[PDB]
């Protein structure tokens, strides 16, 4: 509620989404099994086999809540299509306010033609941020991001990973293929309004992780899907490259049912525990 945050929006469908901006209200959960009916798993897709290049603009008007959504290069966007704060985030959630035509600060409550947002994005460390996410006037999530990757593959099931999908291309990785929040095909980043833009990612458990990108510090409150009894055989573990948090004397904090990329504490390979999914042993 600052005088540098655009608030132009029409609840034209009378769905009452704007209320959650002011006072929290529970989201009707019975609609999710239909809303996420086309968020296919990473397992059922094609397999990349060749050189990997920064992909081209993928315009298919897909749904922006699934993890495998392929955003597009963007930039300046008129200030009359954004309601609520815009979260365009470096690996740690950060917020960019409204600016003037040429970047100078503006304090007009976003109710003016001159005010505009700038979202010229490039990968870190030398860039600024990976991707953006906001909700436009009438209440639909919108996203941006740097070009996804062209995994290739054979058949019409090409993937074009917007995130760090170790499977289907061992060389794909977040720092080189990331687009938006999804650190892996399972886990989001957590910011105050995450429950607003992404409606019912509300049962995700929260983990403490810290990551290194170009020799810089980062603390992330990743909020990552789960449920007990889910098969997590060794062929169901995605590379969430990161700096562990030293959870205990001889254990590390890892995203659920996954693994990080580091040599053991001493004379050891990666040693993952069979039942406690989110622990990787230092030395074993």
């Amino acid at each position, epitope marked *: 509620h600052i005088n540098r945050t655009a608030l132009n929006c029409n609840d034209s469908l009378h769905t009452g989404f704007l*209320a959650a901006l002011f006072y929290t209200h529970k989201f*009707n959960a019975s609609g999710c099994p239909e809303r996420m009916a086309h968020c296919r798993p990473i397992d059922e897709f094609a397999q990349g086999w060749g050189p990997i290049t920064y992909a081209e603009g993928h315009g298919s008007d897909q749904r922006p809540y699934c993890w495998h959504y392929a955003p597009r290069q963007c930039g300046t966007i008129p200030a009359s299509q954004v309601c609520g704060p815009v979260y365009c985030f470096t690996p740690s959630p950060v917020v960019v306010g409204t600016t003037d035509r040429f970047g100078a600060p503006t304090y007009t409550w976003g109710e003016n033609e001159t005010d505009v947002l700038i979202l010229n994005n490039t990968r870190p460390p030398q860039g600024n941020w990976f991707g953006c996410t906001w909700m436009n006037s009438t209440g639909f999530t919108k996203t941006c991001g740097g070009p996804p990757c062209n995994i290739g593959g054979v058949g019409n099931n090409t993937l074009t990973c917007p995130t760090d999908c170790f499977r289907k291309h061992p060389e794909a990785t977040y720092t080189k293929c990331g687009s938006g929040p999804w650190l892996t095909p399972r886990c989001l980043v957590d910011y105050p309004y995450r429950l607003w833009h992404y409606p019912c990612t509300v049962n995700f458990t929260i983990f403490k992780v810290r990551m290194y990108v170009g020799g810089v510090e980062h603390r992330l409150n990743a909020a990552c899907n789960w449920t007990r009894g889910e098969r997590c055989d060794l062929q169901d573990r995605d590379r969430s490259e990161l700096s562990p948090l030293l959870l205990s004397t001889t254990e590390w904090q890892i995203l659920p049912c996954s693994f990080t990329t580091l040599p053991a504490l001493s004379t050891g390979l990666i040693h993952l525990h069979q039942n406690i999914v989110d622990v990787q042993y230092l030395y074993g």
Partner: antibody
Framework: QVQLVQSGAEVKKPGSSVKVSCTTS????????ISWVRQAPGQGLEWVGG????????KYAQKFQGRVTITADESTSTTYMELSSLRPEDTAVYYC????????????????????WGQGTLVTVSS | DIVMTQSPSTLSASVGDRVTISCRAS??????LAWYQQKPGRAPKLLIY???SLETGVPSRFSGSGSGTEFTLTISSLQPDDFATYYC?????????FGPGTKVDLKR
């Protein structure tokens, strides 16, 4: 698609108190702020009171302070309004409709009574 | 306080005519206003807000206007579904207010 359903028709005697409720159903969210209105027969409508969707602290018209209380529960998405000291002229049909924030801007954002409305419940305050 | 009044108390016209209704307040209100159409014996509906903007699903024929104290809900052409009473309403953060109500009927 949201449907609002009120209580049934009621009859009471002057001096008593009457309690009326209505529940929302089939909405993307769970709890909606509900605001009530009243019209004496053959007269223009009049706004009784309701739950503010900005702070949830119920607000009444200046001529119902104390006389009317507004309470609601989050379990069933139901809202309650009870009266006190019914005079004979309160006979009317009572409507409950959502107080939904539609327009927003200018350092503040204004709410409105939005379609649809409850079917209507009739109270006949006579002895 | 705020008192909203309408003039005239009743109006008359025929199908296809152009009619005008006036709602005026005691103290100047910038644009906070809205007109509800109340069919006799049924639940009222919203027509316009901000004194100029249409509501989704409302035929474009309805066209409000005005600002300050005086406002109006002028209809270019009447229709058989237009015969009702329009309660010019004011709103704000705390309270709401309604006017006595205008009626429009056939001319004979």
């Amino acid at each position: 698609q949201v449907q609002l359903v009120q209580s049934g028709a009621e009859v009471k005697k002057p001096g008593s108190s009457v309690k009326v409720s209505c529940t929302t159903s089939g909405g993307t969210y769970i709890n909606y702020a509900i605001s009530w209105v009243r019209q004496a027969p053959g007269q223009g409508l009049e706004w009784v009171g309701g739950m503010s969707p900005i702070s949830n602290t119920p607000k009444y018209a200046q001529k119902f302070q104390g006389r009317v209380t507004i309470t609601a529960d989050e379990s069933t998405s139901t809202t309650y309004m009870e009266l006190s000291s019914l005079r004979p002229e309160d006979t009317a049909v009572y409507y409950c409709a959502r107080d939904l924030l539609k327009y927003c801007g200018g350092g503040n954002c204004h709410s409105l009574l939005v379609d649809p409305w409850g079917q209507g419940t009739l109270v006949t305050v006579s002895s | 306080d705020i008192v909203m009044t309408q003039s005239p108390s009743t109006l008359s016209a025929s199908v296809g005519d152009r009619v005008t209704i006036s709602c005026r307040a005691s103290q100047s209100i910038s644009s906070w206003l809205a007109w509800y159409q109340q069919k006799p014996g049924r639940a009222p509906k919203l027509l316009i807000y901000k004194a100029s903007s249409l509501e989704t699903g409302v035929p474009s024929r309805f066209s409000g206007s005005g600002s300050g104290t005086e406002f109006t809900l002028t209809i270019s052409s009447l229709q058989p579904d237009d015969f009702a009473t329009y309660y010019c309403q004011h709103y704000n953060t705390y309270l709401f207010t309604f006017g006595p109500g205008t009626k429009v009927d056939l001319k004979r």
